[PDB]
Structure formats: C-alpha cells, structure tokens
Design a protein around this ligand. Sequence first.
Ligand SMILES: CC(C)[C@H](NC(=O)[C@H](Cc1ccccc1)C[C@H](O)[C@H](Cc1ccccc1)NC(=O)OC(C)(C)C)c1ncc[nH]1
Lengths: 99, 99
Amino acid sequence: PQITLWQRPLVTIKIGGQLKEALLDTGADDTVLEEMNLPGRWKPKMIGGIGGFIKVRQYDQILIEICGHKAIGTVLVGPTPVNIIGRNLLTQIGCTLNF
Amino acid sequence: PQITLWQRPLVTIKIGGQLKEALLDTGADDTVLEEMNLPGRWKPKMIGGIGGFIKVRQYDQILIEICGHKAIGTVLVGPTPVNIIGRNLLTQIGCTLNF
Ligand SMILES: CC(C)[C@H](NC(=O)[C@H](Cc1ccccc1)C[C@H](O)[C@H](Cc1ccccc1)NC(=O)OC(C)(C)C)c1ncc[nH]1
C-alpha cells in the first residue's frame, strides 16, 4: 500500500502469537517494542533517542508478519512509549520513501 | 526521489541562510533541529521521544527548503542528537511511505 503521512503510519503486526499495532519508522535504525512475552535467550543492550538512553533486551531471529508480510529480525524489547518498526525490518518488507 | 531504507534517509536542507543534513522521519510528529541560530521570537515546549522528554524552543512559520522543495512550518530547536524532518513538514513536500 501507499501511505500518506497526514496521520501516524500505524500497521498491525503479529509477533509471538500476539497482535499489536506499530509505527513504520524511517528514523529508527532498530525495531523496539513495548514489553511483552517473547521466548528465548536475549542479550542486554542500551539504545538512545531524544531524551536519552533506555535499557532493552535483544532477540535475534524473531519472526514478525507486518501489515501482513513475514520478516525475521532483531527485535529489541523494553521501555518504549510506542512500538517502532525500524529500518532493519522496513528494508525486508521492501518499504521506500517517495516524494 | 525514491529513497530505499538501506542507509539512514538523510537529505540536505536549507534553513535560514544555513545548509544542514537532516533525517526524513515518519516516526516524528514534529521537525526538531539541533541548536541553531534562527531569527525571532520562539516559545518553550517539551517533547517526549524514546528515552524521555527534552526542552526545546519553538518556532512557527519558518521556511525550509527540503531537497529543493520549499515548505513552511513549525521548527523546534533544541538538544536532539540529529536534525529530524517530521510529519508536519513531510506532508507538505508530498512524501509517502510505500511497500
Ligand atoms: C532505535 C530508535 C528508537 C532510535 N531512533 C529514534 O529514537 C528517532 C530519532 C533519532 C534518530 C537517530 C538518532 C537519535 C534519535 C525517533 C523516532 O522517530 C521517535 C519514535 C517515537 C514516536 C512517538 C513517541 C516516541 C517515540 N520519534 C520521536 O522521538 O519524536 C520526535 C518528534 C522528538 C522526533 C534510533 N535510531 C537510531 C539510533 N537510535
């Protein structure tokens, strides 16, 4: 689909059995989601945005169906206000910015 | 143009006499630029991003040339790590997200 930006670009994603709404974010290098129950071992990481640094858990090899499209990537889980799909997965669903 | 997300979408901008590089960000409702030298009255405002909230000075009706597109809107100047072009200016130059 073609998405105009008059509203926030929100899409439904299905991750580990759960359905969530998330932001197609061109300014996020990483995908960070709010806390949830994801299986597997994870690594401790820290990331920064406006306002500073948050501590997150990284999970590699996770599968996500974005606005119905499958992709597998590193998903960082931890204290974010909104769920963010960043460039590591956006390039997997063939997303482009057009103007 | 058509920008693929394999690298950060940086575009050259012209804001008040000066040349800067900024990120095209669909996860940002506002345009936030790093501490610059802008003419005028500005008003305080606080914004939240993933690691917290920052105090920025707000500017309205500021002209910006984003890639040869002149657009006019509110520009927030403050302590951001990178200059961000958010949806309030992205819609003016006709920028869409596509997949
Ligand atoms: C991993 C993501 C979260 C992170 N990116 C962001 O936080 C980017 C900005 C940035 C890019 C590069 C370096 C620093 C900051 C911002 C996102 O677009 C965020 C996503 C979000 C939406 C709504 C509420 C809270 C957060 N937007 C945001 O911070 O809002 C403003 C208006 C201040 C830009 C990032 N990308 C690269 C390094 N860190």
